[PDB]
Amino acid sequence: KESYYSIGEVSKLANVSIKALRYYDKIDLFKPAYVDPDTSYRYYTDSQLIHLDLIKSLKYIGTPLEEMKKAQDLEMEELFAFYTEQERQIREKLDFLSALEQTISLVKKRMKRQMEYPALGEVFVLDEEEIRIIQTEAEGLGPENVLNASYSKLKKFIESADGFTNNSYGATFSFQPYTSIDEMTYRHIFTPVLTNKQISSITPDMEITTIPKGRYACIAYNFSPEHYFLNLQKLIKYIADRQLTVVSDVYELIIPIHYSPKKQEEYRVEMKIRIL
Amino acid sequence: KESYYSIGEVSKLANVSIKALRYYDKIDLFKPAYVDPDTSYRYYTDSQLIHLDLIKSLKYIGTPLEEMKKAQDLEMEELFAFYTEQERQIREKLDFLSALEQTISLVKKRMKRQMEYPALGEVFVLDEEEIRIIQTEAEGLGPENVLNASYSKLKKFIESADGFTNNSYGATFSFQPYTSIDEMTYRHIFTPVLTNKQISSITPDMEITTIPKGRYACIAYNFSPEHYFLNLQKLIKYIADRQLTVVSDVYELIIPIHYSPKKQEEYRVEMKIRIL
DNA sequence: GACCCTCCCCTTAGGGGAGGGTC
DNA sequence: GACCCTCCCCTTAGGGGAGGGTC
Ligand SMILES: CN(C)[C@@H]1C(O)=C(C(N)=O)C(=O)[C@@]2(O)C(O)=C3C(=O)c4c(O)cccc4[C@@](C)(O)[C@H]3C[C@@H]12
Ligand SMILES: CN(C)[C@@H]1C(O)=C(C(N)=O)C(=O)[C@@]2(O)C(O)=C3C(=O)c4c(O)cccc4[C@@](C)(O)[C@H]3C[C@@H]12
């Protein structure tokens, strides 16, 4: 009333740190009513304690301090407007997050699916849910000469609307009685999508399409160049012997087993191909 | 394939800034496969481009970099677990925000209500929705000697569970034919609550209770010491003349008109009191 | 030219000290 | 002792330069 509080008093009363109060002092956001010229001690009137209500609340919603300053000079109506503005900012974040939460949930679904492949090396046949992807003409690209840099555009679009890139890399090709990997060329390289956000200015050389819900002859193994071709052969054989008919191209996905640059690279490969 | 990308190439391919790549280099998160000893130029193999998928995605969800490091060495299963952990962190933020969004919406409702008081200075009678508050014994505290520091404990609890403090300050007293502000003493001082989060270790000297839904004789004005008492008198008179019966104490709320420390302080005052 | 280098300063909002003089 | 002072270093993840030597 007829005295000042010293900074410690104010700090206990307002549950704000001393270091905080000295800061707010520095930045002319909250300044002691009076400062002893000899001890440079800070002293605060009781009535001025009220300006902390606003600072503490804005701080809680996380308004930057320089913002708070321009906040103080607001009329009750403009303060209303300002709050409305926060409501907007928030709702934006809530959307971002509901989205994020789902994307992750799905990434997890896919990862699990891969940690459950019944047999590596063996040809299992199974029923698969639809997979949406974005693909693009593979212009004379075999397994032998394809690079990560080849995925640069696809990646750019997908991550530009999914925000998530860590993923698996895809390729399709014609099912033939290949006798040599030398004979192989990809029709498309592709990359799966995780969101429904619309890619923004998608150019015509990208096709958005999917891997149809259907029944697939699959095979999946950890990568090694010996095994790559010979496993493909396992598959062609599986179909040969069971006289199955194919209704799609061979799909091929390579997903990394880890991303530590300290261990030798290792990749899970999965070839599947739809049948009637 | 049989060459390196220079940092600019990698930057365009992976849509990551050069300054970013030099940083990741510094912190041994991503390092060029090779560094020219003479030009200190950075050079990156195509195959190592894959470690950016993970970094870019973690960055999107906003994992700190030192975290990403310990992320890299994870097995596909532990990476799963890690993601689950993010799902937790997020859901936490989504809650925080749905909460925040509501609190604000309500603050706005109250503010509006105050920018619509039909007449300042005049005694309007009206129907009011319930107001939840937290109050505490006012120990020999009149209008004449009450301080902001008096609200220190209430404030602490309410903000400890509401996160929002900027507010209005309350007091109640007995409705009497007062002849002098000298004669006035508050029964309680109080402060409204905005959340339903439970105050955590609430001590018994606080009572959580509310201002009942009911019909109230109100009066509200911008503060000035001349007017304070004389307006209270206006109210006592209103009731006298209409022979109304009172079923509650006088409630009194002071909310600030602005929080700029640059203008002369100004407060909206509102006295209301319930009737049959 | 175009491209890359290191090195330096700047960005929030204070928290943690050290070392001094205080109520 | 308890309390307060200034002053200094440290915390993310780089962006923006300046000034040098490059492909
Ligand atoms: C585009 N694609 C399907 C694969 C890819 O982009 C990869 C990647 N980004 O991780 C593989 O590492 C991928 O680049 C990769 O590792 C491949 C190979 O190195 C080989 C080699 O050396 C010999 C035979 C077959 C392959 C291969 C078909 O598995 C190659 C697949 C490549
Ligand atoms: C607790 N309460 C209801 C009010 C309060 O805490 C205030 C605040 N924190 O802003 C008022 O400024 C409050 O502290 C305040 O301003 C009050 C006063 O200064 C006076 C004076 O000087 C003379 C008569 C009446 C009042 C008064 C009743 O309006 C006082 C109300 C005070």
Side-chain angles (χ1 to χ4, degrees), chain A residues 1-11 13-18 20-25 27-69 71-74 76 78-90 93-97 99-108 110-116 118-121 123 125-152 154-196 198 200-261 264 266-275, chain B residues 1-11 13-18 20-25 27-69 71-74 76 78-90 93-97 99-108 110-116 118-121 123 125-152 154-196 198 200-261 264 266-275:
Chain A
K1 197 181 166 274
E2 290 169 309
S3 71
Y4 312 116
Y5 304 120
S6 74
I7 205 167
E9 272 141 89
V10 173
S11 157
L13 291 157
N15 186 24
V16 172
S17 64
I18 313 206
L21 298 182
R22 298 205 199 107
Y23 195 77
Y24 302 165
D25 194 4
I27 57 183
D28 318 324
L29 184 67
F30 195 61
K31 295 180 182 297
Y34 167 85
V35 171
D36 191 332
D38 308 317
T39 61
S40 293
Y41 268 40
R42 302 170 167 78
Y43 291 100
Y44 299 81
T45 64
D46 173 271
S47 70
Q48 82 172 119
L49 287 197
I50 209 155
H51 305 305
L52 288 175
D53 288 334
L54 176 74
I55 293 184
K56 282 163 71 193
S57 292
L58 286 183
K59 156 174 190 79
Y60 178 71
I61 85 173
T63 293
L65 307 185
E66 317 280 359
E67 222 59 65
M68 302 194 193
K69 296 201 193 204
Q72 309 202 281
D73 302 335
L74 285 214
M76 184 168 276
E78 308 189 309
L79 181 51
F80 187 102
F82 168 94
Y83 286 135
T84 324
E85 166 59 10
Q86 317 308 281
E87 275 172 331
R88 205 189 58 84
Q89 276 190 257
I90 300 183
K93 288 187 214 173
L94 290 167
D95 293 10
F96 174 99
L97 299 171
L100 196 57
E101 172 182 33
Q102 270 168 5
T103 297
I104 298 190
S105 203
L106 160 52
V107 160
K108 289 214 321 179
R110 307 278 200 60
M111 289 188 52
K112 175 165 192 180
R113 173 190 61 217
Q114 284 140 24
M115 298 175 290
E116 282 174 342
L120 291 194
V123 173
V125 152
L126 41 93
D127 292 321
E128 297 257 53
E129 296 305 293
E130 186 178 2
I131 286 102
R132 175 153 83 267
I133 69 173
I134 163 168
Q135 53 162 40
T136 172
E137 183 178 2
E139 248 177 304
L141 287 198
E144 282 164 325
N145 69 339
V146 69
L147 298 166
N148 283 310
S150 310
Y151 285 84
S152 206
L154 298 168
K155 278 302 182 194
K156 289 184 203 153
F157 286 121
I158 85 152
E159 87 192 38
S160 296
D162 259 7
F164 238 87
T165 190
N166 101 319
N167 228 5
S168 54
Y169 298 78
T172 87
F173 46 101
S174 205
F175 177 82
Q176 311 276 320
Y178 292 98
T179 59
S180 176
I181 174 175
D182 219 5
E183 285 164 355
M184 303 202 302
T185 300
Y186 292 148
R187 207 188 297 280
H188 305 86
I189 76 181
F190 73 84
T191 182
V193 304
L194 312 169
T195 314
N196 312 317
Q198 302 148 208
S200 295
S201 278
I202 174 141
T203 58
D205 57 318
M206 316 299 268
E207 175 182 357
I208 294 155
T209 194
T210 83
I211 293 187
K213 175 174 198 156
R215 152 180 300 263
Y216 290 94
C218 297
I219 195 195
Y221 50 106
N222 295 338
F223 182 70
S224 45
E226 274 285 2
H227 290 163
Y228 178 81
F229 186 56
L230 300 59
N231 271 330
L232 161 51
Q233 285 301 356
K234 267 192 204 129
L235 191 74
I236 292 176
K237 174 176 191 60
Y238 182 80
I239 309 209
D241 302 340
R242 316 216 169 199
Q243 291 165 308
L244 320 176
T245 88
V246 293
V247 310
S248 64
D249 269 17
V250 183
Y251 295 92
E252 162 176 311
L253 297 98
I254 278 80
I255 186 162
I257 311 306
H258 66 76
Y259 288 96
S260 168
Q264 209 206 359
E266 214 194 357
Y267 310 76
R268 166 65 58 76
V269 146
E270 179 170 348
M271 278 180 254
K272 64 179 180 180
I273 163 176
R274 192 194 194 180
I275 72 192
Chain B
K1 197 181 166 274
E2 290 169 309
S3 71
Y4 312 116
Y5 304 120
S6 74
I7 205 167
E9 272 141 89
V10 173
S11 157
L13 291 157
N15 186 24
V16 172
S17 64
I18 313 206
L21 298 182
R22 298 205 199 107
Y23 195 77
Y24 302 165
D25 194 4
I27 57 183
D28 318 324
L29 184 67
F30 195 61
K31 295 180 182 297
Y34 167 85
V35 171
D36 191 332
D38 308 317
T39 61
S40 293
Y41 268 40
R42 302 170 167 78
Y43 291 100
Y44 299 81
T45 64
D46 173 271
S47 70
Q48 82 172 119
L49 287 197
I50 209 155
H51 305 305
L52 288 175
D53 288 334
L54 176 74
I55 293 184
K56 282 163 71 193
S57 292
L58 286 183
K59 156 174 190 79
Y60 178 71
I61 85 173
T63 293
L65 307 185
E66 317 280 359
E67 222 59 65
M68 302 194 193
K69 296 201 193 204
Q72 309 202 281
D73 302 335
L74 285 214
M76 184 168 276
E78 308 189 309
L79 181 51
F80 187 102
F82 168 94
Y83 286 135
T84 324
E85 166 59 10
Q86 317 308 281
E87 275 172 331
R88 205 189 58 84
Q89 276 190 257
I90 300 183
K93 288 187 214 173
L94 290 167
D95 293 10
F96 174 99
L97 299 171
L100 196 57
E101 172 182 33
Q102 270 168 5
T103 297
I104 298 190
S105 203
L106 160 52
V107 160
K108 289 214 321 179
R110 307 278 200 60
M111 289 188 52
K112 175 165 192 180
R113 173 190 61 217
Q114 284 140 24
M115 298 175 290
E116 282 174 342
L120 291 194
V123 173
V125 152
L126 41 93
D127 292 321
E128 297 257 53
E129 296 305 293
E130 186 178 2
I131 286 102
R132 175 153 83 267
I133 69 173
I134 163 168
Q135 53 162 40
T136 172
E137 183 178 2
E139 248 177 304
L141 287 198
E144 282 164 325
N145 69 339
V146 69
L147 298 166
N148 283 310
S150 310
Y151 285 84
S152 206
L154 298 168
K155 278 302 182 194
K156 289 184 203 153
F157 286 121
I158 85 152
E159 87 192 38
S160 296
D162 259 7
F164 238 87
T165 190
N166 101 319
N167 228 5
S168 54
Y169 298 78
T172 87
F173 46 101
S174 205
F175 177 82
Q176 311 276 320
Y178 292 98
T179 59
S180 176
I181 174 175
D182 219 5
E183 285 164 355
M184 303 202 302
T185 300
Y186 292 148
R187 207 188 297 280
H188 305 86
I189 76 181
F190 73 84
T191 182
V193 304
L194 312 169
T195 314
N196 312 317
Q198 302 148 208
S200 295
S201 278
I202 174 141
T203 58
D205 57 318
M206 316 299 268
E207 175 182 357
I208 294 155
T209 194
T210 83
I211 293 187
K213 175 174 198 156
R215 152 180 300 263
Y216 290 94
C218 297
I219 195 195
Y221 50 106
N222 295 338
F223 182 70
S224 45
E226 274 285 2
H227 290 163
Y228 178 81
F229 186 56
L230 300 59
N231 271 330
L232 161 51
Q233 285 301 356
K234 267 192 204 129
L235 191 74
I236 292 176
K237 174 176 191 60
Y238 182 80
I239 309 209
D241 302 340
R242 316 216 169 199
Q243 291 165 308
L244 320 176
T245 88
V246 293
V247 310
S248 64
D249 269 17
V250 183
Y251 295 92
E252 162 176 311
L253 297 98
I254 278 80
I255 186 162
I257 311 306
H258 66 76
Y259 288 96
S260 168
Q264 209 206 359
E266 214 194 357
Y267 310 76
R268 166 65 58 76
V269 146
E270 179 170 348
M271 278 180 254
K272 64 179 180 180
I273 163 176
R274 192 194 194 180
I275 72 192

